[PDB]
Amino acid sequence: MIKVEIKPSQAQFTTRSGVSRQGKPYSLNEQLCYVDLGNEYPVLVKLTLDEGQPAYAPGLYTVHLSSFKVGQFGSLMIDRLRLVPA
Amino acid sequence: MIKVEIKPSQAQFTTRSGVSRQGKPYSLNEQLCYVDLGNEYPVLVKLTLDEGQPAYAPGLYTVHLSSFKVGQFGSLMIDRLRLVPA
């Protein structure tokens, strides 16, 4: 299990916006977190939230299986990092 | 934890080869496996092995932390799926 932490300073999201190729509006909500990759300190990672989801509250989390998909070359990839409480 | 299984029929690797942009030879060893992504059946996934590593033997495995890296846009990505015995 991957340990992910939302620090107190990371409790909000920001929103970026634009227009798709054929005219549709979009909005993306982004939140920061720390992921422990086994180095001397955790590293900073950007999360893009799913539609209608609030920012994750401060605390400890692990990664949900729905984060993964098989990519177009047949290898496993991360689609979007989706979290669940630890 | 991600459940990965090497079936008896997947106990070997194949090798692809070529030459890099500035003349260096390379060889890549590839092995297949099944990864349970929570659908009705596990899905087929291609693994690229690291230099000097044998094919994983048949059995159950989970994913090592070294599989992950922060990508050039700041989000988490899979570098290469690296496995450890379950």
Across the interface, do A76 and B77 touch by the CB < 8 Å criterion? no
DSSP A19-80: E-TTS-EEEEEEEEEEE--SSSS-EEEEEEPPTTPPPPPSEEEEE-GGGEEE-TTSSEEESS
Domain of residue A21 covers 1-86
Closest residue in A to B70 (Cα–Cα):
A45
Tell which of B10, B68, B69, B72 to mutate to test the A interface (max A CBs under 10 Å).
B68
* Experimental resolution (Å): 1.8
Element (H, E) at A14: strand A14-19
Is B48 exposed, middle or buried (CB count within 10 Å of its CB: 0-12, 13-18, 19+)?
Answer: middle
Q: At A22, which CATH number?
A: 2.40.50.140
> What does the longest C-alpha to C-alpha distance in chain B come to?
46
Structural domains counted in chain A: 1
Of A45, A76, A81, the CB nearest to B35: A76
Within 13 Å and on the Cβ side, how many CA atoms surround A86?
12
Sort A8 into a burial class: Cβ within 10 Å, 0-12 / 13-18 / 19+. Answer: exposed
Q: Do A16 and A73 touch, CB atoms closer than 8 A?
A: no
